[PDB]
Nucleic acid binder design. Structure first.
Ligand SMILES: [Zn+2]
Lengths: 104, 50, 74, 47, 21, 71, 188, 88, 117, 183, 204
RNA sequence: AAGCUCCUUCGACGAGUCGAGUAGUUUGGGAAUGCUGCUCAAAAUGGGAGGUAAAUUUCUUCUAAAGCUAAAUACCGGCCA
RNA sequence: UUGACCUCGGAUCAGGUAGGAGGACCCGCUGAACUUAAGCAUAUCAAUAAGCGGAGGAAAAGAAACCAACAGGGAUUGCCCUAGUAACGGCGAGUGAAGCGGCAACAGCUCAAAUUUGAAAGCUGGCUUCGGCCCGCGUUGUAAUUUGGAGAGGAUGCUUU
């Protein structure tokens, strides 16, 4: 069985829409039957498919919760070491010190 | 579901025996051409005038 | 100096770095004109120059833009 | 009769177009210089 | 002018009329 | 304004427009109305002499004592 | 506000005026619903309120006026959404037969069934229907318990204050024989 | 009410703007058959065949925006299904 | 009530007599163009809509096709002899029909029609 | 009758045949230039009912314009800006009309019917010599096309009180102070 | 390698797209056309019934003008023009319809096969709008129709109707309600197994 | 060539447009006053807008998504007076 | 081998057109703040000024998917009152129409939707002794007929060029 991985903000928003009691399974199929449905993708050249992919992305609202969820999921494990955050604080403190001395 | 289903001829399966229009036919479809009559008359005037 | 002579308007208002006249905007086809300076508009409006042809138009309209010569002219 | 050669030529041209348009950034070319090849493309020999 | 307008003006032109007092 | 000052200062002549009017004010021709129309009288007065009516709507004001052209 | 009070309520949108009042009955048949609360506006000014039992049951039309909804910063009260309310009725509602059928319809509509799974578990508000004039006055009050001085009930008004003048009663979904007519209704 | 003798006015073709054109109905039916169905119409057909009439009507209302539009779309599609059955 | 710039939007009608004389000369010119003809077209007698003004009649836009037919004036010919035609108005009443056909027949009896060329 | 059959076929836009045709075509138009000439009109029925004739002097120009908003909304339409751009390209022609041919998720595609006013056939033919007249220069820029009328609200009724006969002219008429001689 | 011109690349891409995309039945039935022998016989009859050139018509008009200066039978011609032929089909005067397979805005002919089928008029799909435009004296004819012929070709018309209807309509009726396209070549399939083994296996 | 008349024959009327939801702006005008953007996306004894508590949504009045057209109106600019 | 059609190009090819100015008035886009009032905020200024695009002698609008509720009116535009009314506004600052009615002026029309099919009857060029000769456009539709208070077709008898 294929392992399904959600990495996109639109998919996270739709996942939140399922998880919370806003729209159910019957809905998801119902607005699944739309104009982008029943479009052939199997035997098509890569240039054709990629041009449609780039110019035919459906637009749906995204939520700040879904965006934060994708950010948390895609955060690297060594993204925020103590050393890096401490040197970031040191850099910004130096920046304010230099700003003050330029003001002087 | 069938992604590409065959068409079911629910309307063209019934052959209708009459034209869609009941309008009457004009006289000009049975009599000679008035337009060519006029054209030939113009040409005759041109020939007579030289 | 930042301003030399413009060919379109004759003033020393052509930037040498930007290559754009500060008065009329030489590179651009349109002549620089703004409605917050009625004094500039009336300084360079039509009628302030020579009017080589627009002055000759009205008499031709008065006669009806007729063409030809008077009858019997030599 | 099936346009196989024509598809092959057009696909080669489109791949060249993508490769050049991406290679005109020099970060992409650093990346393809450093990236490694996979073994699921050498598959077919014995495994 | 259009041929239909020409026919209409040919057969129904503006007529001269006077109304008594 | 600058155009007017330039015209006042130049030696070019002033192109004087004659009082040409788009529409004629008096009938012309060799017909009865043309040869009976009075140039110094008004529309209603001329029509009253003619014995014809001028306005087919109801009068929007007070007519002259002898007016007979505003039905 | 009424739909928020009603946990067995499906809200629906604008209904075509050129349609049929029993086309409304098959609309209710779509959502397995035995009660219809229909809002019909005239001239964009005057409300008309229909209470109906969809299949065969009687229906009643009221003229709705005097409307001070919630979201008005003078009510000083609040209550749970979907909690089963106490229904207060009047001696007139018990005595006049047309008022009795109106009472039954109101009970069926605002009933909030006992074991319904969208209802809140605790009771905190009362919907009172009264007949002062030849009109029905509807008000909702929240129940505040207060300890006695050595508990008692206080009522603070919450929302939907509205007046309904009973225009018509029909033996049918939205038709059938006329059973009661006001014969005193004055139209705006 | 000023008593004035009512007059019988002639039929107005602008009032006759109601479309009873047999040839227009023929063209519409033929174009339906030739063109086919939208994806939402195909979902409505599936629901109508498997018997979920209420779900079909509600889905049609959701897609179109009016109860009357949903009812007429469902009636059109149901008569299409009946015609297909008879033609088969 | 001068919160806007009425000074830049203020209008003075000092040309009232000038506009009056211009209008009178326009009427004179129109009559000179149409010398035996009146200058104005005949209008029907119509009743005013509102209950406040339903007791008074005024002039309408043009005559209806059926009242033109009843009076005996052909439809395509009426505008040529100077009768305004309105294809939108409907009679709805023998009273208006009779009043308008009486007006049309009075015009008929007072008319002088010239023999084409 | 083919015109009417095509009218019904264009009424049905999500039908299978129309959807397939629209997809393949949006690909074609997107591979072509943003503004480019059309010889044959793609929707002949729509062109005919909007005023297109198979004469010498009538051209189609198809244009794609980016969709979306400025949260601000442009008061003129995407069709209006497409017409203006087509006219600016074909400055020597007069924009008669425009119509929709395809949407896409990034663009929007229109075909503009344009008429050459200096052509002898157009000048000789009536019913188009009106557009040969000079008062009709840049109707798309002045809002005199169908999109312009729709955006200006040139309709009659009590719902269009402020917008018929000119919104700004009506505003001036209502906010001008009239002072007669004898007050 | 070498870079083709944009328009050449575009039309070759169109050829690939037409061959690989699955078309609806109403366009698949246009992909199916008739054979050389039927085309030749039909064009023989239609060449017997070609219309007259402008030079020929002016020449005839001069003949009658001179004859008058110092009583005919009705002409028989191959009817052309989309609106005219469609009206003939609706009013059931057309005996044969021949419809070009390559019309640019295809919508102009899509309904024609179904319309002919319902009206009962025999129809066939001819390769070449240019061929039809050569049959008539034009550049492009989208559809042509035979309504009436002389007595000397009545039987030839009838037998052409029978032969066309059987040997073409039976086959296209066997395959006309089905979708076309799906002509995957070797490269297209190899790409398809590539996509399937890249997607359906581990991650999506 | 044209007008009328009569009839055991006919009578085609504008679609990503209406409309529903939503955001912005605007209006005296949430039956959204109009406009624009995005999602969904129609009909044919049809559609739009009004009247009506009067018993069902009756009655009234016009035909949208194509186009032309002088006069009465503005006018600090142009030719003058 | 040749030749058609479709699409796309070249030419200091034959003939034309656009730009800029002006912008008083006119049609659109875009779009402030000062000021005033109010615990505050919306509002007001103002759908204004400034900026951008586009015409003319006028422009624009315009011949009802209108007004109305009458005994009904009848394209558009402007004046008078309507009226500081209805209506929206902490029912603050305030904002603020329209129908009717009197007048001025009046004028109605063209396409798409039908098959000329007993005859693309239409039109651009350029060659002309000017009178008519060819190249083409066009059937994926140029003429004539018709535009829903209509109309078509037949018949019929008068009437108009
Ligand atoms: Zn300069």
């Amino acid at each position: 069985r294929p392992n399904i991985d959600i990495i996109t903000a639109e998919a996270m928003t739709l996942a939140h829409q399922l998880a919370t009691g806003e729209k159910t399974k019957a809905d998801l199929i119902d607005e699944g039957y739309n104009k982008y449905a029943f479009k052939q993708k199997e035997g098509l050249p890569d240039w054709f498919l990629e041009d449609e992919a780039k110019h035919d992305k459906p637009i749906k609202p995204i939520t700040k919760e879904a965006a934060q969820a994708i950010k948390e999921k895609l955060r690297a494990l060594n993204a925020r070491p103590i050393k890096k955050v401490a040197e970031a604080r040191a850099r910004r403190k130096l920046r304010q010190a230099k700003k003050l001395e330029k003001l002087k | 579901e069938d992604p590409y289903p065959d068409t079911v001829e629910w309307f063209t399966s019934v052959e209708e025996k009459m034209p869609l229009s009941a309008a009457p036919e004009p006289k000009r479809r049975f009599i000679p051409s008035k337009n060519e009559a006029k054209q030939i008359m113009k040409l005759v005037r041109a020939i007579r005038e030289g | 100096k930042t301003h030399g002579l413009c060919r379109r308007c004759g003033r020393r208002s052509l930037h040498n770095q930007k290559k754009v006249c500060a008065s009329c905007g030489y590179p651009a086809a349109k002549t620089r004109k703004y409605n917050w300076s009625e004094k500039a508009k009336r300084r360079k409006v039509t009628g302030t120059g020579r009017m080589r042809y627009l002055s000759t138009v009205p008499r031709r309209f008065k006669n009806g833009f007729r063409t030809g010569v008077p009858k019997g002219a030599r | 009769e099936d346009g196989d050669q024509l598809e092959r030529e057009l696909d080669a041209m489109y791949e060249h177009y993508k490769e050049r348009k991406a290679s005109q950034d020099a970060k992409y070319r650093a990346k393809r210089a450093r990236q490694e090849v996979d073994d699921e493309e050498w598959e077919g020999l014995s495994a | 002018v259009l041929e239909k307008t020409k026919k209409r003006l040919t057969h129904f032109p503006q007529r001269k009329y006077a109304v008594k007092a | 304004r600058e155009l007017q000052k330039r015209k006042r200062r130049s030696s070019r002549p002033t192109i004087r427009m004659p009082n040409r009017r788009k529409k004629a004010l008096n009938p012309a021709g060799n017909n009865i109305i043309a040869k009976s129309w009075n140039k110094k009288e008004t529309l209603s007065q001329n029509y009253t002499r003619f014995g014809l009516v001028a306005k087919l709507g109801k009068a929007t004001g007070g007519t002259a004592p002898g007016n007979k052209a505003l039905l | 506000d009424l739909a928020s009070m009603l946990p067995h309520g499906r809200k629906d949108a604008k209904f075509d005026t050129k349609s049929r009042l029993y086309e409304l009955c098959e609309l209710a048949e779509l959502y397995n619903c035995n009660n219809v609360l229909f809002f019909e506006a005239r001239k964009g000014k005057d409300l008309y309120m229909w209470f109906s039992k969809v299949p065969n049951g009687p229906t009643v039309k009221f003229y709705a006026q005097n409307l001070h909804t919630m979201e008005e910063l003078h009510f000083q009260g609040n209550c749970l959404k979907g909690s089963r309310p106490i229904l207060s009725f009047d001696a007139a509602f018990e005595q006049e037969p047309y008022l009795k059928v109106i009472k039954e319809l109101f009970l069926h509509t605002f009933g909030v069934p006992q074991g319904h799974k969208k209802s809140k578990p605790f009771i905190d508000h009362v919907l009172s229907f009264s007949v002062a004039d030849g009109k029905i006055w509807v008000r909702n009050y929240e129940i505040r318990e207060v300890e006695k001085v050595k508990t008692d009930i206080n009522l603070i008004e919450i929302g939907p204050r509205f007046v309904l003048t009973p225009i018509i009663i029909q033996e049918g979904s939205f038709g059938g024989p006329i059973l009661y007519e006001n014969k005193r209704f004055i139209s705006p | 009410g000023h008593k004035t003798t009512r007059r019988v006015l002639k039929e107005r073709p602008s009032r006759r703007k109601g479309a009873q054109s047999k040839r227009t109905q023929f063209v519409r039916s033929l174009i339906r058959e030739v063109a086919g169905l939208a994806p939402y119409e195909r979902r409505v057909i599936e629901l109508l065949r498997n018997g979920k009439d209420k779900r079909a009507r509600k889905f049609s209302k959701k897609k179109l925006g009016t109860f009357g539009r949903a009812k007429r779309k469902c009636e059109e599609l149901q008569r299409i299904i009946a015609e297909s059955r008879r033609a088969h | 009530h001068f919160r806007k710039h009425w000074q830049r939007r203020v209008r003075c009608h000092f040309d009232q007599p000038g506009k009056k004389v211009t209008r009178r000369l326009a009427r004179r010119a129109k009559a000179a163009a149409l010398a035996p003809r009146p200058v104005d077209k005949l209008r029907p007698i119509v009743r005013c809509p509102t209950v406040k003004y339903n007791r008074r009649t005024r002039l309408g836009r043009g005559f209806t096709l059926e009242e033109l037919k009843a009076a005996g004036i052909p439809r395509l010919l009426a505008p040529t002899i100077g009768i305004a035609v309105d294809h939108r108005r409907k009679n709805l009443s023998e009273e208006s029909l009779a009043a308008n056909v009486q007006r049309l027949k009075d015009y008929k009896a007072r008319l002088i029609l010239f023999p084409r060329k | 009758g083919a015109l009417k059959y095509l009218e019904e076929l264009s009424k049905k836009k999500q039908s299978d045949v129309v959807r397939f045709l629209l997809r393949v075509r949006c690909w074609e138009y997107r591979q072509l230039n943003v503004i480019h000439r059309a010889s044959r009109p793609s929707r002949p029925d729509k062109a005919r009912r909007l005023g297109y004739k198979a004469k010498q002097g009538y051209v189609i120009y198809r244009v794609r314009v980016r969709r979306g908003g400025r949260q601000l909304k442009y008061q003129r339409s995407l069709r209006a800006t497409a017409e203006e751009r087509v006219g600016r390209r074909c400055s020597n022609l007069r924009v008669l009309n425009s119509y929709w041919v395809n949407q896409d998720s990034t663009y929007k595609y229109y075909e503009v019917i344009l008429v050459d006013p200096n052509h002898k056939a157009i000048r000789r033919d009536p019913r188009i010599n009106w557009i040969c007249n000079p008062v009709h220069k840049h109707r798309e820029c002045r809002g005199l096309t169908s999109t312009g009328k729709k955006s200006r609200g040139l309709n009659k009724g009590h719902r269009f009180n402020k917008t018929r006969a000119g919104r700004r002219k009506t505003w001036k008429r209502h906010n001008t102070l009239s002072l007669w001689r004898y007050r | 390698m070498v870079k083709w011109p944009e328009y050449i690349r575009l039309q070759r891409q169109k050829k690939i797209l037409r061959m690989r995309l699955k078309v609806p039945p109403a366009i698949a039935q246009f992909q199916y056309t008739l054979d050389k022998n039927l085309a030749a016989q039909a064009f023989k009859l239609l060449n017997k019934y070609r219309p007259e050139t402008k030079q020929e018509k002016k020449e005839r008009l001069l003949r009658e003008a001179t004859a008058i200066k110092e009583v005919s039978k009705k002409p028989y011609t191959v009817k052309y023009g989309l609106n005219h032929v469609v009206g003939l089909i609706e009013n059931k005067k057309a005996s044969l319809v021949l419809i070009a397979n390559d019309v640019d805005p295809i919508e102009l002919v899509v309904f024609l096969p179904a319309l002919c089928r319902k009206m009962g008029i025999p129809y066939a799909i001819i390769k070449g709008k240019a061929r039809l435009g050569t049959l008539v004296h034009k550049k492009t004819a989208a559809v042509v129709a035979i309504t009436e012929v002389r007595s000397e070709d009545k039987n030839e018309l009838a037998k052409l109707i029978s032969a066309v209807k059987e040997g073409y309509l039976e086959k296209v009726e066997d395959t006309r309600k089905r979708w076309g396209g799906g002509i995957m070549g070797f490269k297209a399939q190899k790409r398809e197994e590539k996509r399937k083994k890249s997607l359906e296996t581990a991650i999506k």
